[PDB]
Write a protein that binds this ligand. Structure first.
Ligand SMILES: *[C@@H]1O[C@H](CO)[C@@H](O[C@@H]2O[C@H](CO)[C@@H](O[C@@H]3O[C@H](CO)[C@@H](O)[C@H](O)[C@@H]3O)[C@H](O)[C@H]2NC(C)=O)[C@H](O)[C@H]1NC(C)=O
Ligand SMILES: *[C@@H]1O[C@H](CO)[C@@H](O[C@@H]2O[C@H](CO)[C@@H](O)[C@H](O)[C@H]2NC(C)=O)[C@H](O)[C@H]1NC(C)=O
Ligand SMILES: *[C@@H]1O[C@H](CO)[C@@H](O[C@@H]2O[C@H](CO)[C@@H](O)[C@H](O)[C@H]2NC(C)=O)[C@H](O)[C@H]1NC(C)=O
Ligand code: NAG
Ligand code: NAG
Ligand code: NAG
Ligand code: NAG
Ligand code: NAG
Ligand code: NAG
Ligand code: NAG
Ligand code: NAG
Ligand code: NAG
Lengths: 170, 338, 341, 49
């Protein structure tokens, strides 16, 4: 590996084809370094545009994109340093047990145009195979009876459900 | 161990272990005639032009360039391989074993004084030796070979028909390759001995017989390793639908390889019904290597997720609503720096 | 396709005279195997997270497709009581047949094994120390809407809370959410079903000279086969040497010429193998971010209704479905664009 | 900018003595032109969309 020794031990035909082996050998190792290094920069140009979207939309806001901050209803995202990068911790609520219930866009007293109708306020109308309707939050079955300041008094709409009764809400 | 550079191998799947096969080197693919002899380097009257011989496309024979006495010529002896008619070579490699490109040979004779025989200067592709006509009288005969052509191929022992049905790394007309051969009724152009379909060698022609080249499918295997006395073998490129001594001296059945979509399986259970949810040893194409009780090949499966999209309710119907939720944690790593 | 490369067998086939001279190069054989095995890990990491996104929950009560011909075009073709398990759909079979293979060779043999899909038949191949291993899930054998990692056809328009009865009820509420019909009758939905059916039957008439989606599949098939062929052309030719056999070169020349012509086969073959590894890592580094784009189109176009302009195609997004293509995934986007004003 | 590369003229300009020795390398001139033309296709596909 010494360039003086190679040229002071051989003739100038052999000491110039064996100095073209150290040099051509070392030029390849250095060139393969530079190609693999530029291959990593060109990959991280676009990985940075993905990291900046997860900071602005998962960590510093509440996002409306399905599956972007992990699967499920997004509660919280926090972020930590890792060796040579960043690690995101995503916390989400996924469903566990289910239940089949009846549901409707809203309720009307009679099937004539001009009857009093209700829809639910901030949730859904459910029944669970009962003779009377109930209120639940829209992503969890947790039923409540119907009340003033729990429903909204509206006009009709496309296909509300008729009770042929009057509402118990005074 | 020598492939993995370990002494205590942990359980895993270790790929692309290979199998050795013989070697068959063909310099020429057709039989030849016999060579001429040497012209004895003796002249009639006083002195005449020494007779030459052209050696090409023939079979030189053993030690028929010296006198049958086994004392005189022995200065051209090197080792147990000793049939070497050259002394100093220019500039080709001196030892003659196998084939040489078809020289022209001229011989000669001279009186030997001082018991020392001198070297005339050589142009390249001229190599010479010298023997003794008679040693106690000190008269030596010599010969120099002038390789006028490259590729005439004087060769001993005309080549013979190869063995059809065994993997072996051939070398036929400057092209080395590996595979098996079989007899074919396919005929191609007489200009060519080799034939390519695209870029793969498909036919060879040896001694006028055309052999279709096939890839030998048992050259590579994976090991489904569990311990010293329990492992399984998977030959990822072999089709054992129909049709072995390497495996009779490792494990019990000669035959009884299972034909899978992954390859031919040996001494491992194939259970395509059963599924695994955590595959720590994947095989590829949806499969998993179970290496915990014994060796078994099962199917991979994934846990199913849901969506936060809820279709809005426009008429009275049934809906499937959740009763409770599970909090999960998802770690996501992304590389940002070097 | 994953690869497994034995560096010594490619370069110095059986010659022990050659294997001594590879030892003098500065960790070459260790470096080639560490990069192939490292890039095969990253590809198995991305395909595994992809099929954890494809795998979705389906209803136990399957809704009927009224006049939408979904099961004809997208669902796997209904298996007979025989030895014909065609796991692909009708579109997935049309996408493999319209893509031509390049010619005879080693990638053409590999591609036709996947296109034929014969049951319990291996497609892996070995030549000269280079094995072609299937990946962890191998989409080219599968159907998107059937099997163990099966996608949900219904999760994107029936949503996460199941219960709507038919596709006519589902597409009626999607037209309401798009703001084009207040209450959809049967003639408004049948007009949407006829347009859906004619646009999907027109996929059968795609030509590779006109369709920009088939040209993208053909560009992947042409660069896979040009990469295999550089790796097979690298071991049929001397690189300035006299032959390709390392024993013949050293038993025919002197040790000054038989060591500069063994440095031509070896330096020649080291370049072909190194150019393979660089082009292979160049494709892995591209697909790290293409996977983050595929996972967004599955979660927001296919399994939800998105509010992003132009993300699921141009216009008011009705539906997105997804099929397997050769070496990738194909999304079908259906949208309403305005016509008269 | 798109490129169009003739591999023989870059390396072995007019020399027929040189063009015989490029033939011994393992499909070099075919490989360079297929990668330039292949990368010029992908760039024309992205600019068109
Ligand atoms: C409220 O009433 C509805 C309607 O009666 C109930 O839904 C029905 O529940 C049954 C019992 O699970 C379901 O039948 C089952 O179907 C599966 C799959 O086909 C089968 O394996 C079972 O053997 C059984 O046949 C039925 O599909 C379902 N009906 C609908 C329209 O979804 C519901 O459970 C009731 N809810 C409560 C809280 O009582
Ligand atoms: C919610 O409302 C229902 C009906 O409006 C109530 O059900 C009644 O419960 C009482 C005793 O709890 C019974 O005597 C009635 O016969 C029930 N009515 C019906 C129609 O079943 C229910 O108790 C209410 N729950 C709460 C917490 O107020
Ligand atoms: C969508 O599916 C329907 C139902 O299979 C197809 O209608 C049938 O077409 C065949 C032609 O081979 C006729 O023999 C049947 O009588 C038709 N049935 C009905 C109910 O109309 C329809 O052609 C399909 N549409 C497209 C565009 O493929
Ligand atoms: C309520 C609680 O803390 N944990 C419950 C657990 O007991 C139950 O097995 C699981 C399945 O639904 O749901 C959750
Ligand atoms: C006025 C109106 O739109 N009525 C529709 C009716 O035609 C349809 O059969 C029913 C289905 O549940 O939904 C309601
Ligand atoms: C004496 C001798 O060599 N005979 C062989 C003969 O057996 C063979 O059939 C023929 C085919 O080339 O070649 C010659
Ligand atoms: C000789 C052989 O094949 N395997 C042996 C095994 O029998 C032994 O139990 C182990 C102890 O570490 O060493 C290894
Ligand atoms: C016996 C066994 O392998 N159990 C595993 C469990 O540890 C793991 O948590 C789960 C996936 O989360 O898959 C299963
Ligand atoms: C209504 C229908 O089926 N097709 C019409 C077509 O006749 C018309 O030419 C086009 C241009 O506005 O709009 C659409
Ligand atoms: C409500 O009353 C109307 C008018 O008599 C009747 O047509 C309808 O069927 C009734 N619906 C229910 C649910 O009782
Ligand atoms: C192979 O099968 C034989 C059956 O006797 C037995 O040696 C063992 O169960 C298997 N594995 C190995 C490594 O021999
Ligand atoms: C198990 O696999 C066999 C053959 O692959 C098949 O015939 C059988 O129906 C399968 N059984 C189950 C329960 O999937």
């Amino acid at each position: 590996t010494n360039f003086k020794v190679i040229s002071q031990r051989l003739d100038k035909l052999e000491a110039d084809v064996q100095m073209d082996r150290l040099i051509n050998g070392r030029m390849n190792v250095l060139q393969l370094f530079v190609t693999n290094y530029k291959l990593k920069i060109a990959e991280l140009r676009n990985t940075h545009r993905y990291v900046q979207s997860l900071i602005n939309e998962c960590v510093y806001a509440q996002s409306l994109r399905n599956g972007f901050c992990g699967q499920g209803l997004h509660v919280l995202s926090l972020m930590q340093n890792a060796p040579s990068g960043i690690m995101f911790f995503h916390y989400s609520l996924i469903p566990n047990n289910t239940i089949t219930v009846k549901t409707t866009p809203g309720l009307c007293e009679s099937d004539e145009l001009g009857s009093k109708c209700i829809v639910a306020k901030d949730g859904v109308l459910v029944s669970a195979n009962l003779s009377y309707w109930q209120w639940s939050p829209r992503n969890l079955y947790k039923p409540e009876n119907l009340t003033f300041a729990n429903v909204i008094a509206v006009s009709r709409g496309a296909n509300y459900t008729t009770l042929n009764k009057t509402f118990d809400i005074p | 161990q020598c492939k993995l550079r370990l002494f205590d191998i942990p359980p895993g799947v270790y790929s692309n272990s290979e199998v050795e096969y013989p070697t068959a080197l063909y310099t020429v693919v057709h039989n030849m005639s016999a060579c001429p002899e040497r012209p004895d380097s003796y002249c009639g009257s006083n002195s005449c032009p020494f007779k030459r011989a052209v050696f090409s496309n023939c079979i030189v024979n053993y030690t028929t360039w010296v006198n049958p006495d086994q004392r005189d010529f022995q200065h051209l002896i090197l080792s147990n391989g000793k049939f070497n008619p050259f002394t100093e070579c220019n500039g080709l490699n001196r030892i003659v074993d196998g084939c040489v490109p078809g020289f022209v040979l001229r011989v000669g004779r001279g009186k030997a004084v001082n018991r020392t025989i001198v070297t005339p200067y050589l142009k390249p592709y001229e190599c010479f030796g010298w023997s003794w006509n008679d040693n106690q009288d000190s008269i030596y005969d010599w010969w120099i070979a002038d390789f006028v052509s490259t590729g005439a191929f004087v060769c001993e022992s005309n080549p013979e028909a190869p063995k059809t049905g065994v993997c072996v790394t051939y070398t036929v007309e400057k092209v080395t390759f590996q595979g098996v051969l079989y007899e074919s009724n396919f005929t191609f152009a007489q200009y060519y001995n080799l034939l390519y379909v695209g870029s793969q060698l498909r036919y060879v022609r040896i001694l006028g017989k055309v052999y279709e080249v096939s890839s030998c499918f048992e050259a590579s295997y994976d090991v489904l390793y569990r311990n010293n006395q329990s492992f399984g073998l998977l030959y990822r490129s072999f089709d054992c639908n129909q049709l072995s001594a390497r495996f009779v001296d490792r494990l019990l059945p000669s035959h009884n390889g299972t034909a899978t979509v992954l390859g031919c399986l040996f001494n491992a259970s194939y259970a395509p019904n059963d599924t695994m949810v955590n595959c720590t040893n994947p095989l590829g194409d949806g499969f998993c290597a179970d290496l915990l009780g014994n060796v078994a090949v099962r199917r991979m499966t994934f846990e199913k997720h849901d969506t936060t999209y809820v279709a809005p309710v426009t008429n009275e119907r049934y809906t499937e609503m959740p009763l409770d939720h599970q909090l999960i944690l998802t770690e996501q790593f992304l590389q940002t720096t070097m | 396709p994953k690869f497994s490369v034995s560096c010594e067998t490619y370069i110095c086939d059986v010659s022990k005279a050659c294997k001594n001279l590879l030892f003098r190069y500065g960790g070459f054989c260790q470096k080639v195997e560490a990069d192939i095995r490292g890039a095969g890990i990253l590809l198995d990491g991305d395909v595994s997270s992809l099929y954890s996104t494809i795998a979705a929950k389906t209803s136990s009560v399957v809704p009927t497709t009224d006049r939408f011909n979904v099961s004809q075009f997208f669902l796997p073709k209904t298996q007979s009581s025989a030895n014909k398990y065609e796991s692909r759909s009708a579109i997935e079979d049309l996408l493999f047949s319209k893509i031509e293979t390049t010619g005879p060779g080693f990638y053409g043999d590999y591609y036709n094994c996947k296109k034929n899909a014969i049951q319990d038949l291996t497609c892996a191949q070995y030549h000269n120390g280079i094995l072609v291993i299937p990946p962890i899930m191998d989409a080219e054998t599968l159907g998107m809407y059937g099997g163990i990692a099966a996608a949900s056809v219904t999760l994107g328009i029936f949503g996460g809370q199941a219960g709507m009865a038919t596709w006519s009820v589902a597409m009626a509420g999607r037209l309401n959410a798009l703001g084009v019909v207040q209450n959809a009758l049967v003639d408004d939905v049948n007009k949407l079903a006829n347009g859906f059916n004619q646009l999907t039957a027109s996929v059968s008439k795609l030509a590779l000279t006109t369709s920009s989606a088939l040209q993208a599949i053909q560009a992947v098939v042409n660069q896979n086969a040009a990469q295999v062929e550089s790796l097979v052309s690298g071991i049929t030719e001397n690189f300035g040497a006299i032959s390709t056999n390392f024993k013949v070169i050293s038993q025919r020349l002197d040790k000054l010429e038989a060591d500069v012509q063994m440095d031509r086969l070896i330096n020649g073959r080291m370049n072909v193998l190194q150019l393979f590894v660089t082009n292979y890592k160049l494709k892995i580094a591209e697909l790290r971010n293409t996977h983050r784009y595929v996972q967004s189109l599955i979660n927001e176009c296919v399994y939800a209704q998105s509010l992003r302009n132009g993300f699921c195609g141009q216009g008011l997004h009705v539906l997105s479905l997804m099929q397997n293509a050769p070496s990738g995934i194909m999304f079908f986007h259906y949208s309403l664009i305005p016509n008269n004003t």
